[PDB]
Coordinates of N, CA, C and O in Angstrom, one line a residue:
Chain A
X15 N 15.3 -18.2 0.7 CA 14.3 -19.3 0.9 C 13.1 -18.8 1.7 O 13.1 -17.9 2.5
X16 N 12.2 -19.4 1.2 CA 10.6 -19.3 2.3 C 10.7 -17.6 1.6 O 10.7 -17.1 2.7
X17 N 10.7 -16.9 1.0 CA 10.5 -15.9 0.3 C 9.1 -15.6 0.6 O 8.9 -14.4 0.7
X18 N 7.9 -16.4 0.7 CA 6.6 -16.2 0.2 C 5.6 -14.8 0.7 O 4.7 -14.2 0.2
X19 N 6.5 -14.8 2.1 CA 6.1 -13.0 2.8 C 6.1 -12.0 1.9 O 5.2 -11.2 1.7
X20 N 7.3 -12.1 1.1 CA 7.5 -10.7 0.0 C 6.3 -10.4 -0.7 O 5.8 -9.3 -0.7
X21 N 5.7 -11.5 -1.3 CA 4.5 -10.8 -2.1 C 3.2 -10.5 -1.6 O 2.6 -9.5 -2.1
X22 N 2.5 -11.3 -0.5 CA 1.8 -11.2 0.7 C 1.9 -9.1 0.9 O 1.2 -8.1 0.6
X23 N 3.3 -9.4 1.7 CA 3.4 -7.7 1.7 C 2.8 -6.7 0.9 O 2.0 -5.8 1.1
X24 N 3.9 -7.3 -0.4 CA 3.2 -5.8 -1.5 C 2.0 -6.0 -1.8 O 1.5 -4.9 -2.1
X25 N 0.8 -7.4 -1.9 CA -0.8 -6.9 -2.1 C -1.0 -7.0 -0.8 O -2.2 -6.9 -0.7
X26 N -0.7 -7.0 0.2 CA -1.4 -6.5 1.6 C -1.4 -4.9 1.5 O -2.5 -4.3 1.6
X27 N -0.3 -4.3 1.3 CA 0.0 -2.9 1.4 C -1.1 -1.8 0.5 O -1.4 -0.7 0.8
X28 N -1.5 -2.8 -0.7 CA -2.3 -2.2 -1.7 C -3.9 -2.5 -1.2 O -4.8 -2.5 -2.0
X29 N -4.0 -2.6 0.4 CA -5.4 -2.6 1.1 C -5.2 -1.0 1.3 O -5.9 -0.1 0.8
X30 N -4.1 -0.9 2.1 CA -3.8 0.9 2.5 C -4.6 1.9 1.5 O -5.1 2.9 2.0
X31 N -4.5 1.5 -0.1 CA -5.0 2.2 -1.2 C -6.2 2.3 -1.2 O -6.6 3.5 -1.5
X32 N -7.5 0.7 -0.8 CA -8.4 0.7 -1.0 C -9.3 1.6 -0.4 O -10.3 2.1 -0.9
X33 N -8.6 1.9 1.1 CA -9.6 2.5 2.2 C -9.1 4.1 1.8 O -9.8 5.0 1.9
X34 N -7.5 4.1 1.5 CA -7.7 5.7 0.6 C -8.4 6.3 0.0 O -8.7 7.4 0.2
X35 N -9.0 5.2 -1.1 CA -9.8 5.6 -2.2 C -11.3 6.0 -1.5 O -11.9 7.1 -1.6
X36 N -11.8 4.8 -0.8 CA -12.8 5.7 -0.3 C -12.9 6.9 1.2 O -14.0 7.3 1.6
X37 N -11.9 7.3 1.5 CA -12.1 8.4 1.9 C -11.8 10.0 1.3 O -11.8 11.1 1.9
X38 N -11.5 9.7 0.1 CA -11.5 10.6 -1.0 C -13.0 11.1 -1.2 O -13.4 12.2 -1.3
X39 N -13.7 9.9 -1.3 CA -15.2 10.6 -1.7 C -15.9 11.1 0.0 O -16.5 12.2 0.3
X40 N -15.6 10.3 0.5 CA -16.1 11.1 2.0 C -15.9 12.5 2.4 O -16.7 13.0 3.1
X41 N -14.4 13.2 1.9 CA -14.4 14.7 1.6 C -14.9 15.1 1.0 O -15.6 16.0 1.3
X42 N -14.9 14.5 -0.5 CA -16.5 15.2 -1.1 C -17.5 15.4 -1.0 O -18.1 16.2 -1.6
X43 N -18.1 14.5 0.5 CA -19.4 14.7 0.4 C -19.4 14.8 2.1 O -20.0 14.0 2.8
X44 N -18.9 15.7 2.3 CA -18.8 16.1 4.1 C -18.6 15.1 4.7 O -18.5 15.2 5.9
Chain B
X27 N 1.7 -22.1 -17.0 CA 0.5 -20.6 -16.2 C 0.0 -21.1 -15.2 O -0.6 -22.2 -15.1
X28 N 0.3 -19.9 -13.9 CA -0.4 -20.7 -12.6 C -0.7 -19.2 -11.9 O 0.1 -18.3 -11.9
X29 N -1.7 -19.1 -11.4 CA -2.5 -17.8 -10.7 C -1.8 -16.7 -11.4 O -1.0 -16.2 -10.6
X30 N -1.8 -15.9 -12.6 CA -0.8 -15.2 -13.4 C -2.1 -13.8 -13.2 O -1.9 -12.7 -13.6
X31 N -2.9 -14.0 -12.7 CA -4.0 -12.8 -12.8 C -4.2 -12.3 -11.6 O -4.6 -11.2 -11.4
X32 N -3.8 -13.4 -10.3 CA -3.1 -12.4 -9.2 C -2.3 -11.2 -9.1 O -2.8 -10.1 -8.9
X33 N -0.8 -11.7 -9.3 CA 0.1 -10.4 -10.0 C -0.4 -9.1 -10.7 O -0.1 -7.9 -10.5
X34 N -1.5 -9.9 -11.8 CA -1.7 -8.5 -12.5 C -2.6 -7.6 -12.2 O -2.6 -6.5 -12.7
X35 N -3.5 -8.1 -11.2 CA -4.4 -7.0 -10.9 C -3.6 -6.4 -9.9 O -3.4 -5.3 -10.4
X36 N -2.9 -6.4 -8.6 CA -2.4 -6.0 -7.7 C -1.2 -5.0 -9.2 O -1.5 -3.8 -9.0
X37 N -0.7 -5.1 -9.7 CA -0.5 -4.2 -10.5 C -1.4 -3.1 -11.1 O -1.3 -1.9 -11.1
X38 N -2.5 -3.7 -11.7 CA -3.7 -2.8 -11.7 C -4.0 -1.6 -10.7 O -4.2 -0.4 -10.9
X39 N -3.9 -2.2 -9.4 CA -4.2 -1.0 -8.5 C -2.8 0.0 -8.9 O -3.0 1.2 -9.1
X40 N -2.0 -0.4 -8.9 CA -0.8 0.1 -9.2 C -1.1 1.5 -9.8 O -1.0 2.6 -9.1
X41 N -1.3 1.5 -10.8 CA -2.0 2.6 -12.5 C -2.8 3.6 -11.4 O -2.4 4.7 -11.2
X42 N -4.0 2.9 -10.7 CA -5.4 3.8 -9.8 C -4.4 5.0 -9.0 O -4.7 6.2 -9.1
X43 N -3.0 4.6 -8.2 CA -2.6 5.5 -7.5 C -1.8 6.3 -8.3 O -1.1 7.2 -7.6
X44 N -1.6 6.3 -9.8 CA -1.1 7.3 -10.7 C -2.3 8.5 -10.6 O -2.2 9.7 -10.4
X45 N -3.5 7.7 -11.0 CA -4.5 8.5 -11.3 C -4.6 10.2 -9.7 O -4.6 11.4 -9.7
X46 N -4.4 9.1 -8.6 CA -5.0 9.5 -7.6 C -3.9 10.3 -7.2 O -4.2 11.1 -6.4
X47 N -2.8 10.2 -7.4 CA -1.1 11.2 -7.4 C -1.6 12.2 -8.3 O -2.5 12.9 -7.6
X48 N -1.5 12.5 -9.3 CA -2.0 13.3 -10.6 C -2.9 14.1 -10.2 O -2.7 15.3 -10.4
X49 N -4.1 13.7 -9.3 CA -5.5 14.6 -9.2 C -5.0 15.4 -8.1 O -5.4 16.6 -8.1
X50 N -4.3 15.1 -7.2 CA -3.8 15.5 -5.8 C -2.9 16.8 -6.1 O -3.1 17.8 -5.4
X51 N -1.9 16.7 -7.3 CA -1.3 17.8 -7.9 C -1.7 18.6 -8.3 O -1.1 19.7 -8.3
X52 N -2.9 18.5 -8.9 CA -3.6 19.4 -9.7 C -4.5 20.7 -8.9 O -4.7 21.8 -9.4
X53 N -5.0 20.1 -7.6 CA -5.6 20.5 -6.6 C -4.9 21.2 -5.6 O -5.3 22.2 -5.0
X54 N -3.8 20.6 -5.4 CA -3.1 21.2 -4.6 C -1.4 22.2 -4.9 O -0.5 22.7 -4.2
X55 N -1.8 21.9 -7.0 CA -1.4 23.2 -7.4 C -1.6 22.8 -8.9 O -1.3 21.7 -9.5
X56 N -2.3 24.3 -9.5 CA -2.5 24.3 -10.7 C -2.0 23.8 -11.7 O -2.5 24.1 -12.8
Chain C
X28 N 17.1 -12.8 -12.8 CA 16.3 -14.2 -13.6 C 15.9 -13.8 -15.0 O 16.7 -13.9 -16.0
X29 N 14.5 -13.4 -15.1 CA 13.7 -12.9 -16.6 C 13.1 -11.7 -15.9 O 13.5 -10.5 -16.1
X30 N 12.5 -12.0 -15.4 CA 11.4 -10.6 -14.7 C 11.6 -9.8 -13.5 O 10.6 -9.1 -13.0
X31 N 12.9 -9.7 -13.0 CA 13.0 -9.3 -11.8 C 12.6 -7.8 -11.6 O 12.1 -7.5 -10.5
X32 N 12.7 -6.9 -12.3 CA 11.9 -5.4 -12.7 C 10.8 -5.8 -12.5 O 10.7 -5.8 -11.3
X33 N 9.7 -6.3 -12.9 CA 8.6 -6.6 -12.9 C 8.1 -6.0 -11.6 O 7.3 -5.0 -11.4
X34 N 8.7 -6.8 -10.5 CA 8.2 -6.8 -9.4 C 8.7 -5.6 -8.5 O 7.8 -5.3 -7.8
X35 N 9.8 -4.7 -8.3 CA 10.9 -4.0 -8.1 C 9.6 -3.0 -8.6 O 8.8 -2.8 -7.6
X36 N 9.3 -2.7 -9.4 CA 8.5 -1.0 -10.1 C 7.0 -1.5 -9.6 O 6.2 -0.7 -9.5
X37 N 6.8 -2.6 -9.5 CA 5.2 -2.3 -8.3 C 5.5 -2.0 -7.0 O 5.0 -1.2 -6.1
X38 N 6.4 -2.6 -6.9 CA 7.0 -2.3 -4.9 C 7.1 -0.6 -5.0 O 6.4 0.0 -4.1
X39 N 7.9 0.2 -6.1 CA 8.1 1.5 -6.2 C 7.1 2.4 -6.1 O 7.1 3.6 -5.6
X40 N 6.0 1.7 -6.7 CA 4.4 2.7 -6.5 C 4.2 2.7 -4.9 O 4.2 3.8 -4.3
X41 N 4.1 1.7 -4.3 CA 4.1 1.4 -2.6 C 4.8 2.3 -2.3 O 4.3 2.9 -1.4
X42 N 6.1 2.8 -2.5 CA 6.8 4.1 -1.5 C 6.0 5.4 -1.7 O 5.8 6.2 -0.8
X43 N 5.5 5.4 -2.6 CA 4.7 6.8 -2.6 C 3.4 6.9 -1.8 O 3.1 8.0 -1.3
X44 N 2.7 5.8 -1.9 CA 1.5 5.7 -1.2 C 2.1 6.0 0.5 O 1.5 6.5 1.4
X45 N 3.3 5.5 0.5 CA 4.3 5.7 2.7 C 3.6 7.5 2.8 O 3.0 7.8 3.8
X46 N 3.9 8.5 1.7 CA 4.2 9.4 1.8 C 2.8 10.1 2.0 O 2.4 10.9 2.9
X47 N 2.3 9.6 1.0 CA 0.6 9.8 1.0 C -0.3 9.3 2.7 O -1.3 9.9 3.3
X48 N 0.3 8.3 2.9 CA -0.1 7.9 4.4 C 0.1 8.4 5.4 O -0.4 8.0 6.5
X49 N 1.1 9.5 5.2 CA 1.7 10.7 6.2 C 0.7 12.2 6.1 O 0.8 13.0 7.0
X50 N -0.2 12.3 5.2 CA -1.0 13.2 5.3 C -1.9 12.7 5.9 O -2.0 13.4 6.8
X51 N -2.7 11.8 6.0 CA -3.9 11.1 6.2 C -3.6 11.3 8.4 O -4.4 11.8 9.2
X52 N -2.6 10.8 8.6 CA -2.3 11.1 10.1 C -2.5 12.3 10.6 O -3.1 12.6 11.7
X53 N -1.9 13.3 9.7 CA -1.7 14.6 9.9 C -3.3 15.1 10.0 O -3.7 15.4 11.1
X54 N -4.1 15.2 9.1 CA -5.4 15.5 8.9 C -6.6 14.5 10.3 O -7.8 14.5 10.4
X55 N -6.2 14.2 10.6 CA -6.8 13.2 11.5 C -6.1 13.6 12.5 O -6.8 13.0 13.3
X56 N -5.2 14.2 13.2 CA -4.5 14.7 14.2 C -4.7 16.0 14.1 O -4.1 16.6 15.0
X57 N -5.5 16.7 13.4 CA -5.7 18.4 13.7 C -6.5 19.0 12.8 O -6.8 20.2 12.8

């Protein structure tokens, strides 16, 4: 019951990715 | 059908961290 | 239910990104 945290989690988690992504280009470019 | 395009993009990002696994191997071996 | 995989194999991409998030510390610590 009240489950609703579960999915909250897994797209919250998929923010971790976004700021990944841009410090990928930030090594490319010093 | 109710918010059904939530789910699917948070899957979407899903695919981007194949991309971004894949490039990481490649670089960090031939 | 119907879809319970569905959700189980996006959660699975998220363990990898844990592992990826362990370099990011490391690189930022030295």
């Amino acid at each position: 019951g009240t489950t609703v945290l579960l999915p909250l989690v897994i797209f919250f988690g998929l923010a971790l990715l976004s700021l990944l992504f841009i410090g990928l280009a930030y090594r490319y470019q010093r």
